[PDB]
Amino acid sequence: MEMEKEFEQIDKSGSWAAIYQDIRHEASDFPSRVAKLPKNKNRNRYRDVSPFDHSRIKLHQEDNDYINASLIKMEEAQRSYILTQGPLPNTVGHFWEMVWEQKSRGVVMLNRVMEKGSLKCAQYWPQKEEKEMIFEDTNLKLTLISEDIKSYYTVRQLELENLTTQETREILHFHYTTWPDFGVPESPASFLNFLFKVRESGSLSPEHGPVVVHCSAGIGRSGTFCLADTCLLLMDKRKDPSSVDIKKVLLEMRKFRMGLIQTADQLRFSYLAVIEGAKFIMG
Ligand SMILES: CNC(=S)N(Cc1ccccc1)Cc1cccnc1
Questions:
Q1: Fewest C-beta atoms under 10 Å: which of 35, 61, 207, 218?
Q2: Distance 113 CA to ligand 1 centre (A)
Q3: Fold of 1-283
């Protein structure tokens, strides 16, 4: 059923809360035993948001390999994503270790450091060129190279150095700065515009490791970003762009990380973003 018409049918019937609970009911439940070990309590931002054991990213160290991060592998679309929480004061070194070890080119940040008067993630990148950051626990150095500030987002060029080998790599930081403190954006135009720039950078392409995507918990805004990208890529590949079922793509993604799309409003916004993107994606 053309998602356009499915959209108008749910809107006129005001059944968004009913559709959303149906997804919550059918979603996968897999064990998260490593996340719940007592040694890992200060590595989790939220007690109720954990990576599944089968899809968790492992740090390459013998001491403690745990980080709150999941590999979302979309087989038909040929795209992979790492979805993670906003880094904590004691996991900023782990965060940059993961980017290094997974060979990522891009980091996508969908939150502000402060929202609703509370801290939603650590200040984990340098704000000035001449004041670099050293992560002593993982042996990494991070330098700000350049910053491009736009009305709806900021792009930064970062240099990550493995202090053990003196290898360096260029990481691109894509920071969506205008998601409102409550609800979702009224129009998906600026979110779609931001997505286009991520792809254009090469950050989502198979020559690199998977893109790292985060918000505060790494399931809500983060879920919306990967769901929209994957649905638009499938509409480009299929002979019948009308066979793309957004609810079925979301349940596939929820096999790899719990709780993706946190509200009925985020579900409606994901439909709007894909729907608007179709007309353009259609040539
Ligand atoms: C309102 N912007 C839309 S719907 N875009 C389409 C799109 C397709 C796939 C992924 C992201 C975005 C972007 C764009 C940029 C420059 C000129 N036209 C369109």
A1: 207
A2: 27
A3: Protein-Tyrosine Phosphatase; Chain A (3.90.190)
